[PDB]
Amino acid sequence: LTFEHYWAQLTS
């Protein structure tokens, strides 16, 4: 729901 939450998903 936050940009950080979605962004963190791009890297393991």
Add this chain to the structure above:
Amino acid sequence: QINQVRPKLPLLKILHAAGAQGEMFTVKEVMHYLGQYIMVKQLYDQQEQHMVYCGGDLLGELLGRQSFSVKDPSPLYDMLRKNLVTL
């Protein structure tokens, strides 16, 4: 070193703007500073935060797009393939 990359100049400018130092980085570092850039410049959509609007921003020139979705990162990954020089 095999785990590092060298961002092309305009992408490096963006990373430096977000606090990065140097010319070579790991992919995780590149992602960290690019994410910080988007966050502090508050380019993401306030209501649907997976959306990033970058029209008129250097990030948009690199992407060749006015916006992108973190949920479909393909255009972002395309930009990184073109702007990250590897070994």
